[PDB]
């Protein structure tokens, strides 16, 4: 229709509400070919983010505002998480190939989004096709210990394993940084606390106040009851 359930196959597992209509087959074709060429070449947290982002890009959520059907673009925070953290390495490698006129063969009209041009999430009806990449997994959050690599460690440990004070995430001195982006919920009020918001390190970590130690893991005990 204008707003209707997703009628395709490739994104069946990722799309749960109404999506925008009016074409729809062209986006199914392209997404299917990209699943084979691009998605299947990705791994780990990048792959997880990319699948959700690709489906939300290709089949935007739809909602009614009075009599008008509204297409919801991607969210700034999800895009930031994907571009600057989860998929940064793969994203840079694609962009560098594009500079040499080497393109993903199956991209069709699809293009990597510019995160800065997208709405910031939140509002009973969302302004974007929110996927939640920056959110905490509540059951895995911990405070006095870490579950596994501590991706969702939210404690107040504020020195590295050798005792160096952490630099604040919201400051660019002594170490300048663009990743992890501060849209991750671990970092919104991250103070100078050890964090593993990207989930790629084996331990929570921080940039340190020592000019000669850009970043270092913190030393946090495993949670007694973590398996």
Ligand X SMILES: *[C@@H]1O[C@H](CO)[C@@H](O[C@@H]2O[C@H](CO)[C@@H](O)[C@H](O)[C@H]2NC(C)=O)[C@H](O)[C@H]1NC(C)=O
Among ligand PAM, ligand X, none, partner that 197 touches (CB below 5 to 8 angstroms by kind): none
Taking CB under 6 A as the rule, does residue 10 contact ligand PAM? no
- Per CB under 6 A, does 81 bind ligand PAM? no
The one of ligand X, ligand PAM, none whose footprint includes residue 168, by CB under 5 to 8 A per kind, is none
Q: Does 116 bind ligand X (CB under 6 A)?
A: yes
Question: Using CA atoms, how far apart are residues 43 and 184, in angstroms rounded to an integer?
Answer: 20
Interacting positions 86-105 with ligand PAM (CB under 6 A): 87, 90-91, 94, 98, 103-104
Answer with the entry of ligand PAM, ligand X, none that 53 interacts with (C-beta below 5 to 8 A by kind).
ligand PAM
Cα–Cα distance for residue pair 118/113, rounded to 1 Å:
8
In angstroms, how far is CA 22 from the centroid of its own chain?
A: 28
- Rounded to a whole number of angstroms, the CA Rg of the chain reads 20
Contact between 19 and ligand PAM by CB under 6 A: the answer reads no
- Work out whether the CA dihedral 54, 57, 61, 62 comes out positive or negative: negative
- Min CB(196)–ligand PAM separation in Å: 21
CA distances from 95 to 57, 85, 111, 133, 179 (A): 18, 15, 10, 22, 18
Contact yes or no for 141/168 (Cβ under 8 A): no
Is residue 212 close enough to count as binding ligand X by CB under 6 A?
A: no
The entry of ligand X, ligand PAM, none that residue 128 binds, CB within 5 to 8 Å by partner kind: none
Cβ-based nearer residue to ligand PAM, 34 or 183: 34
Binders in 130-189 for ligand PAM, by CB under 6 A: none
User: Considering Cα of 100, then 101, then 104, then 109, what sign does the dihedral take?
Assistant: positive
Beta-bridge partner residues of 19: 4, 61
- Quote the least distance from Cβ 114 to ligand PAM, whole Å: 10
Using CB under 6 A, list all residues that contact ligand X.
114, 116-117
């Amino acid at each position: 229709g204008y707003c209707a359930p997703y009628s395709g196959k490739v994104c069946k597992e990722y799309l749960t509400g109404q999506v925008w209509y009016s074409g729809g087959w062209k986006n199914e074709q392209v997404t299917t070919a990209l699943w084979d060429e691009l998605i299947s070449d990705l791994t780990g947290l990048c792959r997880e983010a990319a699948e959700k982002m690709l489906c939300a890009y290709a089949f935007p959520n739809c909602h009614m505002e009075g009599g008008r059907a509204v297409k919801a673009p991607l969210c700034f925070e999800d895009c930031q998480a994907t571009h600057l953290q989860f998929c940064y390495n793969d994203w840079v490698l694609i962009e560098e190939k594009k500079e040499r006129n080497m393109f993903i063969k199956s991209r069709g009209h699809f293009r990597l989004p510019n995160c800065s041009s997208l709405p910031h999430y939140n509002m009973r009806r969302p302004n974007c096709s929110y996927i939640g990449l920056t959110e905490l997994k509540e059951s895995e959050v911990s405070y006095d210990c870490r579950n596994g690599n501590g991706r969702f460690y939210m404690g107040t440990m504020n020195v590295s394993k050798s005792g160096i004070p952490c630099q604040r995430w919201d400051t660019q001195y002594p170490h300048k940084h663009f990743q992890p982006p501060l849209v991750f919920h671990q970092l919104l009020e991250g103070e100078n606390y050890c964090r593993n918001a990207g989930g790629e390190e084996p331990h929570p970590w921080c940039y340190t106040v020592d000019e000669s130690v850009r970043w270092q893991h913190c030393d946090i005990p495993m949670c007694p009851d973590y398996v």
